[PDB]
């Protein structure tokens, strides 16, 4: 049927998936123990959880995800957390050695002896699944462990199962903020390995995530708890089509077929319009028109790109809540008549609407507002090559002076593969401008 497997690689990616699964247990009312009240929902495992959890005759919801990490610290503490009894012990794939931010070390030194084990997980989940549309990979480009280890496995999962979808989600590196100077190295390594295998990769940047908090949410001191909450909402919204229904139901296959124009570039941008403080939601009003403007307001994007220096190709709006076609179709018609919104002339229509009647619920101990009309805005533009152009002039500097190379050639690598990445990016950008050229 309609189910998928979530993948969480990197101790960067571990809390957010935990937060996502924490969110998921709320909307289904999942108790931390792993069972409902005396109300009847258990069976062979077929209900709203059958797409996400595995609540077999044993009665325990088993989430369909595997958390893989190379350092035991964070994976053991969550193994001592609140929902650890729900979690499968060796689905929480632990490690004892780090990659030291090195893409190749986690790709060669240790990933070999671990990928077989994590593969044993993914194959053993395969039998219990029936349709298994695809996967939900959570990672990071500047992965101290997320970057390298995922690259090997996605290669392995690409070759064995090339008949299904693979969804990639990674924090895009902060453009002007660098927590690591080797981060440009492993990041570009991830890209050229993923361009020829990844199906749909979506990026996000933390700086603008904070910029939202003290603009409309009015939070000058949020935390990951807040940061993981909002991205957990993002994936919750896109997965609501699997969870509930609506006026029309859409699937990632339709997303894939309609969003990506051409091979290689499959990197659109997400955006959620009704992000607002409770008080601003209180004595104001929410409706399709203003959230349509807000979602199309350039500063509401969590990526440091202004669309007016690029052009639009695809734009998807996923309306979760109480909406009607009348105002939706009329409002978008006005948006098409808008002049500043510069779509490429190649696409007459670039709009994919998803309607879900279920209202987006709040989380206890949360900070969000109570949203009746929501929309997650998935879109791709040519204003994105700015980020890669930022990386290369960064990257071209260090490589010429070849800093830290003694580390990578020290543990067994050479420069030719680093050489390949530069024209691959040069190929990617020139495709971006060529498709930009009408």
């Amino acid at each position: 049927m309609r189910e998928c497997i979530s993948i969480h690689v990197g101790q960067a990616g571990v809390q957010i998936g935990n937060a996502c699964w924490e969110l998921y247990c709320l909307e289904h009312g999942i108790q931390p123990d792993g069972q409902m009240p005396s109300d009847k929902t258990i069976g062979g495992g077929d209900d709203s959880f059958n797409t996400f959890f595995s609540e077999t005759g044993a009665g325990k919801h088993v989430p369909r995800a595997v958390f893989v990490d190379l350092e035991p610290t964070v994976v053991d503490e969550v193994r001592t957390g609140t929902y650890r009894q729900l979690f499968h012990p060796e689905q929480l794939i632990t490690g004892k050695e780090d990659a030291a931010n090195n893409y190749a070390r986690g790709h060669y030194t240790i990933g070999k002896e671990i990928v077989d084990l994590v593969l044993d997980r993914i194959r053993k989940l395969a039998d219990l699944c029936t349709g298994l549309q695809g996967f939900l990979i959570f990672h990071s480009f500047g992965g101290g462990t997320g970057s390298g280890f995922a690259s090997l496995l996605m290669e392995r999962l690409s070759v064995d199962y090339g008949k299904k979808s693979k969804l990639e989600f990674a924090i895009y590196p902060a453009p002007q903020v660098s927590t690591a100077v080797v981060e440009p190295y492993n990041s570009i390594l991830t890209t050229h390995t993923t361009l020829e295998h990844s199906d749909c990769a979506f990026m996000v940047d933390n700086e603008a995530i904070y910029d939202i908090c003290r603009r409309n949410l009015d939070i000058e001191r949020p935390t990951y708890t807040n940061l993981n909450r909002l991205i957990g909402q993002i994936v919750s919204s896109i997965t609501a089509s699997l969870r509930f229904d609506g006026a029309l139901n859409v699937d990632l296959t339709e997303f894939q077929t309609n969003l990506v124009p051409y091979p290689r570039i499959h990197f659109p941008l997400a955006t959620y319009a009704p992000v607002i403080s409770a008080e601003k939601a209180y004595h104001e009003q929410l409706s399709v028109a203003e959230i349509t403007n807000a979602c199309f307001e350039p500063a509401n994007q969590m990526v440091k790109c202004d669309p007016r220096h690029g052009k639009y190709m695809a734009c998807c709006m996923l309306y979760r809540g109480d909406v009607v076609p009348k105002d939706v179709n009329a409002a978008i018609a006005t948006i098409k008549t808008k002049r500043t919104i510069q779509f490429v002339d190649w696409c007459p229509t670039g709009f994919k609407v998803g309607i879900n009647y279920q209202p987006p619920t709040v989380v206890p101990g949360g900070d969000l507002a109570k949203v009746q009309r929501a929309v997650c805005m998935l879109s791709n533009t040519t204003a994105i090559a700015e980020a890669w152009a930022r990386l290369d002039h960064k990257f071209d500097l260090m490589y010429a002076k070849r800093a830290f190379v003694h580390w990578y050639v020290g543990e067994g690598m050479e420069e030719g593969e680093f050489s390949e990445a530069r024209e691959d990016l040069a190929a990617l950008e020139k495709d971006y401008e060529e498709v930009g050229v009408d």
Partner: protein, 37 residues
């Protein structure tokens, strides 16, 4: 290619049950060129 666990274990293990003694999972399931060799 490969359908399921039993074949997954069996086709690529490099573990001689007669020779392998007091080994561990990682040591038990060991694949081939499937990973790199």
């Amino acid at each position: 290619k490969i359908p399921k666990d039993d074949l997954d274990f069996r086709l690529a293990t490099l573990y001689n049950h007669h020779t392998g003694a007091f080994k561990n999972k990682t040591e038990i399931l060991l694949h081939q060129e499937t990973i790199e060799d």
